[PDB]
């Protein structure tokens, strides 16, 4: 019975060459399978299946929940007798042991990684499933649209900008290292928390993020923020209460109209091929909008 050996987080893992059913723990790998035409047959999806990309979802069709990506159902996993499993290498490493005992265990980044190392999760994946060529061609396509929707962004690249969360009585800014903070460098976008700005406000770390109340957030002053919410919704009371804020009201940003409201599963909890795609895609209709 052979196998191909790949590298993950822990080490070699040596995966059956008929590896065909594989249970995933983090919707990055959902999307991975998809772009692969492999349909996973249990997703970690925190029993909220609208958290599955739309294209992703349909392309998936049915699966089993195998519930919160915080703490994956076990029981669930095994009934469902996978071939192989893909863990996130930040949140899983305490089940690792037990997930080994059902099936052979990937441990990738995921939740902690930034762009490119989802985009390297994604080959890893590829390689695992003998469809390394499937997925160069399908990261040649991704580049390509990546590409073409940097230069349709019609936003003036000068303008710097600040991606984040709404959290407490402030914004959980996402740091130019983050996921999000490299893909906008990416689409040639600047993050307003240069690694400077991101030294000199360190002491308001929380994990990767920074917790910027509006006193911080105007000494900050970027011109374009991009605020990741629930459903791209801004009437939040912890939203609300950030907007009827009087120095809020003062930033550049919000003064100007170069603040956007988008959707957090799309932009923050997908880190997918698709999603990032969409992302772009979003950024060039808002670029396009009458001035
Ligand atoms: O989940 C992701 O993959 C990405 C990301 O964690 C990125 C992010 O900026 N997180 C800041 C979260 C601050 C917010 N906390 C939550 O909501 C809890 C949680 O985050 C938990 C989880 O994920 O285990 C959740 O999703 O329910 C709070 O307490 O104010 C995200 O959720 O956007
Ligand atoms: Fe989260």
């Not at 994604?122 to 990546?146: M, Q, V, W």
Request: proline share 3%; net charge positive.
């Amino acid at each position: 019975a052979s196998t191909i050996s790949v590298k993950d987080e822990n080490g070699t893992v040596k995966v059956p060459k008929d590896a065909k059913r594989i249970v995933v723990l983090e919707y990055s790998f959902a999307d991975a399978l998809a772009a692969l035409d492999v349909k996973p047959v249990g997703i970690a999806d925190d029993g909220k299946k609208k958290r599955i990309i739309k294209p992703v979802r349909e392309k998936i069709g049915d699966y089993t929940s195998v519930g919160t990506r915080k703490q994956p159902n076990l029981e669930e996993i095994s009934k469902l007798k996978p071939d192989l499993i893909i863990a996130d290498s930040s949140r899983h490493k305490g089940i690792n042991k037990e997930l080994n005992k059902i099936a052979p265990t990937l441990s990738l980044k995921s939740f902690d990684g930034d762009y490119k190392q989802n985009i390297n999760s994604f080959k890893t994946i590829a390689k695992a499933l003998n469809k390394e060529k499937e997925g160069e061609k399908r990261l040649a396509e991704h580049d390509k649209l990546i590409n073409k929707y940097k230069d349709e962004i019609k936003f003036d690249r000068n303008q710097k900008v600040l991606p984040a969360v709404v959290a407490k009585a402030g914004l959980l800014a996402h740091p130019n290292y983050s996921y999000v903070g490299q893909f906008l460098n990416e689409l040639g976008f600047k993050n307003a928390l240069s690694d400077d700005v991101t030294k000199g406000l360190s002491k308001y770390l929380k994990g990767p993020y920074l917790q910027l109340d509006t006193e911080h957030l105007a000494d900050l002053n970027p011109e374009r923020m991009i605020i990741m919410t629930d459903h791209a919704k801004k009437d939040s009371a912890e939203f609300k209460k950030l907007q009827e804020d009087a120095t809020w009201k003062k930033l550049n940003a919000v003064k100007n109209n170069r603040v956007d409201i988008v959707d957090r599963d799309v932009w923050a909890r997908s880190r997918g091929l698709i999603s990032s795609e969409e992302m772009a895609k979003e950024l060039v209709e808002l670029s396009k909008k009458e001035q």
